[PDB]
Paper text:
We found that a variety of L-amino acids, such as glutamine, alanine, arginine, glycine, and glutamate, but not D-glutamine, induced FRET signal elevation of fluorescence-labelled LBDs, which we had previously found to correlate with LBD ligand binding. Some of them, such as glutamine, alanine, and arginine, also induced responses in the full-length receptor according to Ca2+-imaging. In the crystal structures, these various L-amino acids are bound to T1r2aLBD in the cleft between LB1 and LB2. The α-amino and carboxyl groups and the Cα and Cβ atoms of the amino acid ligands are located at almost the same positions in the binding site in [name], and form hydrogen bonds with the protein, including to the main-chain amide and side-chain hydroxyl groups of Ser142 and Ser165, and the main chain carbonyl group of Gly163, all residues in LB1. Not only T1r2aLBD but also the overall heterodimer structures were very similar irrespective of the bound ligand identity (Cα rmsds of 0.4∼0.7 Å). The shape of the omit map in the [name] cleft in each crystal resembles the amino acid added for crystallization. In the [name]-binding site, the α-amino and carboxyl groups of the ligand form hydrogen bonds with Ser150 and Thr173 in LB1, similar to those observed in [name] and other class C GPCRs structures. The crystal structures displayed that a wide range of amino acids, irrespective of their physicochemical properties, are accommodated to the ligand binding site in hydrated states.
Residue numbers in the entry:
A (entry chain B): 21 to 50, 62 to 351, 359 to 490
B (entry chain A): 25 to 124, 130 to 331, 342 to 392, 396 to 452, 456 to 466
C (entry chain L): 1 to 216
D (entry chain H): 1 to 137, 143 to 224
The structure:
């Protein structure tokens, strides 16, 4: 809290001796135009800023060596994100990518990659980065496709695999004696994968899926959405699992509210705590929403950091990823203090520290000196060798990465409470044991009892 | 003078997997020696088809007059390790500059949906045209996702429909769907499900399969669940795995439906005991004659990584009799790109007067020309408006006898021709 | 061709009790690890509704008071408890081999307490009289069981020619039957006599329920 | 909803031909066998055959070969069944029925959806409209009738007070005797509501285009 007034104003690009590449969805589309600010993704980007600043301010974690980074907008779009991904692979010295068959002696500009947020984006840069054996940690991408080290050789993850979240969802559903549900998802890797994962896991556990459905992320989602809701009505299902990205889910419930439909709603991490969903006029009418989020710590110092930083940024500007960002200010601390950000912020934090600590181990550092100088060359494939099944205590969390690149992070089962406009704690999911307290569940129904 | 290289005024890329190797952990950031791996005779043949198409066009004063076509070709047995040759085609003086006239103007290939999903995003970024001769993943019809992508084989949706046509033309309604444990096989599973949901066809069993699948137990379940129809949606390697294991385990009296990736397979029909597992049906690419390919091959049988075949002492007639599927798709691929360049230079057919690969893309989309009396065009997605499927039956002479046909906008089957085991 | 023989042909079961209908096939209808014997309910004037497929798989929307069992050549449908609208013909069906064949059917009646009919009689309308015809209608409404005897009487004399009868199907609410007895005469014949009697005898009573009118 | 809609009842001469239709909606027409079923009066179900609407393959029970022809029209999602050289034996109800999902063969398939049915009446007798007579008559309840006499062929529909009088209504099955049917319906209402509130017999005979209303008035 006193290293707080030395932190640089540089928001997306920070000079250092070893560099991390950052990939965040900072501005998306409402050639290729990226119009709209993602406030949650700007926030996660802020967490990596905070984490790096704090690591460097720690005099004994990478002693004598300054952590640096380049953060880039992904726009959740192929053409936008491959450009900075390729930029991570340019040689440190020459700022170019040479065409070659053996990159073992090749010194890249970044030693590791933090991000991207979305499983769609990982399928765009995963194998490229994987070929280079460049460590990439996702603070966000949950799809089980990335759990194969043979297909994604340098993939790591601070949040759990969705194979487990759907296990969490189906165990809950079994617990509540519901055998007739529907599954909805967004039409892209995340929702597509979850719907299949849920469907397969549902009937393995004897839950007859009455209907499945995908919501377009390109063109008009609304007509696909009515067919979805008609199938929901005609199957006469009370429980609908919405395994979907945030933007289409808003389009979805917009129409769900429109038909005064109710029932129980199962929420996936991606929208379970989105203000965009819950601020929908009359979303409280839709009934009961039960959710799943990654069980995370609360970064106690995030919000203060941001506040000194945002003052400093207001102080620094006017000067020349986020066009309008260096006009931000202490009023803008809403960004990191959003519940969406606060409860996922730890993922970004652990990603950066996980790399940070690995590097410490790579350079054989104790608390005063690192085996390092200006002639030290770092190849990503050496860092990867260290990160393999890496164990590390970050803050209060004991973090074990399995050989798939998956973490030992489970879930917290939550419920949406409308009259308060809040979320309560109704249980947990750690390992494959779902532990919920039936009594703590509130049931938005005619007589407040549970459906069925 | 390597087979993989050939200089020219404009370069077209060529992505092939001539060798095969199962995925394996690797500790270093470097290419794979594919040359010491398992040779694929049918892939090398398609490989040669590209070389023949370029030579044939080079022989022509009609198409690209006094403009030579060159190529950089690759054998990428692993999709993970293909990026050096990728970087080659997209580089300007063997440098990649991520923020900004490349070595090549377009690329033919790749063969595999898995190869495609791995590299295509890097190509799409600058509307660098890829024309696949093989990738059938239906995700590639979404043009916003893959803007400079086109192909000369149909989507999995179409082939899956034909397969379902075959199933419906008969009386069995329980089916096993065995599919390769990759994106191709998976997409096929999705499309198959999508197609039969509102149907008398009941998917009674399915399983992703690989070369190390416990085929013994896959087949006990199938039996105990009394399934007679076994659709196998898989490419050569995986197909031979299934079928070869089917013979070693007295699997008998089944109806096997093949897709066009193994219905004209050549190892399996001549295999000892194949006739004991029941009857083999399938959709096949109808054999298209490519005048002059035979002479070409006799002439050919006669560095940078993944550009070495290691395949001398190769029999010229093995090559020629290898499964000929995907021939015309390669053929039409090269010709497609050549025609697109011919029109971007605005050549007449006597002579030709700076080509950016996206300029190739717009003419590629507008493609409209005849080839072996076929019309070659694409829809606004990049999918081909040409090609058909024949329905074949494996008979007693080791031949895929043609017993019917499918046309993508209009099935017919002569059932007497099928002799059931 | 497989013959299905159902038993019993007819059956009456009180409300809330158990109905056991059986079906016997000439040959086995097993194949593919299943028994292709199905159960259908046909209500009067309606299409058959599929209750149970493959010997024992209950179909959507059909209450669990319907169930079945059996294999090879012996199959049973059970209805427990029986409810007021379950009167119908129940058919079994095999689809094991071509051609499909149906059992001759079992008719389930709802058994209830015996009830005597309410008996009304109607002289011809003046409208029919002009046509040259004359029907004397008798309604025998809401009785049980179905076995009833009607007799017409024109001046003490019993009349058998010209009598047409018709029963309704069992009633969905009160489980009774009704019947109509129409004696059609010529107007000349009808105006030839004076006293018309419709007399119904039923196990409910010793004595017949007689209903009469004088044409004058 | 899946629906199977059939043609209305037909009156057809001996030795003539007729074609029954089954408009299918609410599913993919070509994905399931359409089956046909004959039921005589003397209730027995009999399988005529099926057709595969994907290729038009047909399968028949032997006694209907050369007597029934199943066709389909994919552009209207209709199944057809033509009956030939009709005799009084073909006088029956016919059902179209769709096969279900779950069977291992098209042959083993069972019947989940049914048409409402098509009555076929094979006769040389000519269409006749009904005569509708009123059956008017001291208890709490009073019974009123309505005789529907001398029509051909089946069916007739009988309602009371435009359907408002449902409870206490018996409409009896027609009896045939001389190529004319006779139906009678009764209605039982309270003694006070009549003749205060008019009670009207509604009789409709489509085949002859007859819609007669009769009020029942006291004698
Ligand atoms: C930290 O900032 C303080 C004053 O805020 C200054 O004295 C000091 O030089 C800074 N420490 C550094 C740059 O290490
Ligand atoms: C930068 O350095 C590497 C070797 O250190 C070389 O391969 C590459 O071509 C250089 N970049 C240039 C020359 O632009
Ligand atoms: C790749 O380069 C490394 C480091 O120089 C070297 O040790 C190794 O031999 C090379 N691998 C090859 C040529 O396959
Ligand atoms: C910062 O806050 C102001 C108003 O408080 C707002 O206009 C501006 O858009 C904010 N910037 C963000 C949210 O990035
Ligand atoms: C984490 O904490 C545990 C318990 O305090 C300790 O035993 C272990 O050494 C730590 N692991 C690390 C620092 O990797
Ligand atoms: C939200 O309502 C819950 C009851 O579920 C309560 O426990 C919690 O304290 C409330 N939070 C508020 C009012 O901020
Ligand atoms: C479950 O919830 C109720 C809430 O009042 C509480 O009484 C009880 O202690 C809880 N049971 C547990 C945690 O086992
Ligand atoms: C060619 O491949 C074989 C294995 O198939 C290997 O033994 C041989 O050394 C290879 N020749 C080369 C790489 O020159
Ligand atoms: C092209 O022309 C040469 C003669 O220069 C001929 O030998 C060869 O067969 C031709 N190749 C083709 C048409 O592929
Ligand atoms: C033909 O092409 C050559 C290069 O291959 C060029 O030098 C020459 O000018 C051209 N000849 C013509 C157009 O007559
Ligand atoms: C193969 O044959 C053995 C007996 O010879 C039999 O027990 C087994 O079931 C057969 N396997 C099949 C049909 O898959
Ligand atoms: C394609 O080209 C032929 C002649 O090249 C022409 O007849 C045909 O109409 C064209 N089709 C189009 C432009 O769609
Ligand atoms: C098998 O098919 C081939 C190709 O159509 C045909 O020429 C040959 O006669 C067939 N052999 C048989 C039927 O044994
Ligand atoms: C159908 O098959 C038979 C038997 O092979 C053959 O003789 C006949 O030509 C075929 N019918 C056609 C092609 O119309
Ligand atoms: N909180 C969120 N909106 N998360 C969305 C990004 C991560 C998402 N689970 C994916 O795989 O794409
Ligand atoms: N391993 C394979 N996928 N081989 C077959 C390549 C061609 C196949 N149609 C595909 O799209 O993938
Ligand atoms: Cl992202
Ligand atoms: Na030329
Ligand atoms: Na495209």
């Amino acid at each position: 809290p006193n290293w707080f007034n030395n932190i640089s104003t540089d928001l997306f690009s920070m000079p250092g001796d070893i560099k991390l590449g950052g990939l965040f969805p900072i501005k998306e589309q409402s050639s290729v135009s990226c119009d709209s600010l993602n406030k949650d993704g700007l926030g996660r980007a802020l967490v990596m800023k905070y984490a790096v600043e704090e690591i460097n301010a720690n005099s004994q974690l990478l002693p004598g060596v300054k952590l640096g980074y380049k953060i880039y907008n992904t726009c959740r779009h192929s053409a936008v994100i491959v450009r900075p991904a390729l930029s991570f692979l340019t040689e440190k010295s020459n700022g170019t990518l040479s065409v070659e068959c053996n990159y073992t002696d090749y010194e890249t500009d970044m030693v590791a990659v933090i991000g991207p947020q979305s499983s769609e984006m990982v399928t765009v840069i995963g194998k490229l980065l994987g070929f280079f054996l460049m460590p990439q940690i996702s603070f966000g991408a949950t799809s089980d496709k990335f759990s194969d080290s043979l297909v994604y050789p340098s993939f790591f993850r601070t949040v759990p695999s969705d194979i487990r979240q759907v296990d969490a969802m189906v165990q809950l559903i079994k617990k509540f004696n519901w055998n007739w549900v529907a599954v909805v998802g967004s039409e892209e890797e995340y929702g597509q994968q979850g719907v299949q994962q849920f469907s397969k896991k549902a009937e393995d556990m004897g839950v007859c899926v009455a209907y499945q459905g995908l919501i377009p992320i390109y063109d008009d989602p609304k007509p696909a959405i009515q067919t979805i809701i008609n199938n929901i009505q005609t199957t006469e299902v009370k429980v609908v699992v919405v395994f979907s990205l945030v933007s289409p889910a808003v389009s979805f419930f917009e129409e769900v509210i429109k038909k005064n439909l109710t029932g129980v709603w199962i929420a996936s991490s991606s929208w379970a705590i989105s203000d965009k969903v819950y601020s929908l006029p009359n979303i409280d009418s839709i009934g009961t929403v039960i959710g799943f989020i990654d069980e995370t710590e609360t970064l106690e110092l995030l919000s203060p950091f941001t506040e000194v930083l945002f003052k400093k940024i207001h102080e620094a500007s006017p000067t020349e990823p986020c066009p309008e960002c260096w006009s931000l200010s202490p009023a803008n601390v809403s960004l990191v203090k959003e519940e969406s950000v606060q409860r996922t912020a730890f993922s970004v934090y652990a990603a950066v520290y996980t790399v940070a600590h690995a590097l410490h181990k790579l350079l054989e550092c104790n608390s005063a000196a690192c085996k390092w100088s200006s002639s030290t060359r770092l190849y990503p494939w050496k860092l990867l060798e260290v990160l393999k099944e890496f164990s590390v205590n970050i803050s209060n969390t004991s973090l074990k990465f399995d050989q798939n690149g998956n973490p030992n992070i489970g879930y917290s089962v939550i419920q949406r409470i409308w009259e308060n406009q809040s979320l309560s704690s109704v249980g947990s999911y750690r390992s494959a044991n779902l532990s919920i307290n039936e009594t703590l569940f509130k049931w938005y129904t005619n007589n407040s009892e549970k459906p069925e | 003078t390597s087979e993989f290289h050939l200089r020219g005024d404009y370069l077209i890329g060529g992505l092939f997997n001539i060798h095969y190797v199962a995925a394996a952990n690797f500790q270093r950031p470097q290419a794979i020696d594919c040359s010491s791996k398992l040779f694929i005779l049918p892939n090398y043949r398609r490989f040669q088809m590209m070389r023949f198409s370029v030579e044939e066009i080079n022989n022509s004063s009609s198409l690209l007059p006094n403009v030579s076509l060159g190529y950089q070709m690759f054998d990428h047995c692993s999709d993970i390790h293909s990026f050096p040759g990728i970087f080659k085609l997209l580089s300007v003086n063997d440098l990649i500059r991520p923020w900004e006239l490349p070595n090549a103007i377009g690329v033919v290939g790749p063969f595999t949906s898995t190869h495609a999903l791995s590299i295509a995003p890097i190509f799409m970024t600058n509307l660098f045209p890829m024309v696949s001769y093989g990738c059938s993943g239906s995700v590639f019809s979404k043009e916003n996702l893959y803007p400079s992508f086109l192909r000369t084989v149909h989507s999995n949706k179409d082939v899956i429909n034909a397969i379902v046509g075959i199933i419906l033309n008969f009386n069995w309604r329980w089916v096993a769907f065995l599919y390769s444990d990759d994106d191709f096989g998976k997409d096929g599973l999705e499309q198959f499900k999508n197609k039969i949901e509102d149907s008398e066809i009941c998917l009674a069993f399915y399983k992703a399969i690989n070369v190390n699948t416990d085929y013994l137990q896959v087949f006990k379940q199938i039996e105990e669940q009394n399934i007679k129809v076994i659709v196998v949606f898989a490419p050569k390697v995986y197909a031979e795995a299934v079928v070869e294991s089917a013979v070693q385990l007295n699997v008998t009296n089944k109806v096997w439906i093949a897709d066009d990736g193994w219905s004209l397979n050549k190892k399996l029909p001549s295999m000892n005991g194949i006739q004991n597992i029941g009857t083999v049906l399938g959709v096949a690419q109808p054999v298209v004659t490519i005048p002059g390919f035979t002479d070409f091959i006799y002439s050919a049988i006669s560095m940078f990584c993944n550009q070495k075949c290691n395949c001398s002492n190769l029999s010229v007639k093995s090559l020629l009799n290898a499964d000929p599927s995907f021939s015309f798709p390669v053929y039409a691929a090269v010709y497609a790109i050549a025609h697109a360049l011919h029109n971007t230079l605005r050549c007449g057919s006597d002579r030709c007067p700076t080509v950016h690969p996206h300029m190739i893309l717009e003419e590629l989309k507008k493609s409209n020309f005849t080839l072996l009396n076929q019309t070659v065009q694409f829809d606004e997605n990049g999918d081909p408006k040409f090609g058909s499927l024949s329905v074949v039956f494996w008979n007693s002479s080791g031949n895929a006898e043609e017993v019917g046909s499918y046309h993508f906008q209009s099935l017919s089957i002569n059932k007497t021709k099928i002799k059931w085991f | 061709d497989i013959v299905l023989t159902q038993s019993p042909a007819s059956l009456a079961v009180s409300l809330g009790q158990r109905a056991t209908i059986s079906c016997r096939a000439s040959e086995s209808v097993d194949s593919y690890g299943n028994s292709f014997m199905h159960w259908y309910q046909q209500k009067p004037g309606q299409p058959p509704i599929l209750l149970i497929s493959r010997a024992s798989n209950l179909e959507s929307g059909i209450p669990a008071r319907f169930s079945g069992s059996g294999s090879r050549t012996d199959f049973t449908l059970t209805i427990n408890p029986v409810e007021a609208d379950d009167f119908a013909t129940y058919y079994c069906q095999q689809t094991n081999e071509d051609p499909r064949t149906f059992g001759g059917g079992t008719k389930l009646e709802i058994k209830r307490a015996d009830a005597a009919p309410t008996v009304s009689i109607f002289p011809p309308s003046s409208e029919q009289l002009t046509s040259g015809g004359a029907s004397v209608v008798c309604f025998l409404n809401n009785f049980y069981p179905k076995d009833i005897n009607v007799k017409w009487k024109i001046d003490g004399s019993e009349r058998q020619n010209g009598v047409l009868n018709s029963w309704t199907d069992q009633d969905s609410k009160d489980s009774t039957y009704s019947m109509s007895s129409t004696l059609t005469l010529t107007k000349d014949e009808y105006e030839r006599h004076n006293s018309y009697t419709c007399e119904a005898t039923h196990k409910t009573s010793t004595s017949p329920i007689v209903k009469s009118f004088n044409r004058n | 909803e899946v629906q199977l809609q059939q043609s209305g009842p037909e009156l057809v001469k001996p030795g003539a031909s007729m074609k029954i239709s089954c408009k299918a909606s609410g599913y993919s027409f070509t994905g399931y066998s359409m089956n046909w079923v004959k039921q005589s009066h003397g209730k027995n179900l009999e399988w005529i055959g099926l057709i595969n609407p994907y290729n038009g393959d047909t399968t028949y029970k032997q006694k209907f070969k050369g007597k029934a022809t199943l066709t389909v029209d994919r552009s209207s999602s209709t199944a057809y069944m033509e009956l030939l050289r009709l005799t009084s034996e073909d006088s029956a109800v016919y059902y179209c029925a769709r096969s279900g999902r779950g069977a291992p063969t098209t042959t083993t398939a069972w019947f989940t959806y049914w048409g409402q049915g098509t009555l076929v009446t094979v006769s040389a007798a000519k269409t006749t409209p009904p005569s509708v007579y009123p059956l008017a008559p001291t208890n709490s309840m009073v019974t009123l009738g309505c005789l529907v006499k001398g029509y051909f062929p089946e069916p007739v529909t009988v309602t009371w007070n435009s359907g408002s009088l449902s409870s206490g209504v018996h409409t009896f099955p027609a009896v045939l005797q001389s190529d004319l049917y006779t139906l009678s319906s009764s209605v039982t209402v309270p003694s006070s509501t009549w003749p205060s509130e008019t009670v009207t017999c509604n009789v409709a005979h489509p085949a002859s285009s007859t819609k007669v209303d009769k009020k029942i008035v006291p004698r």
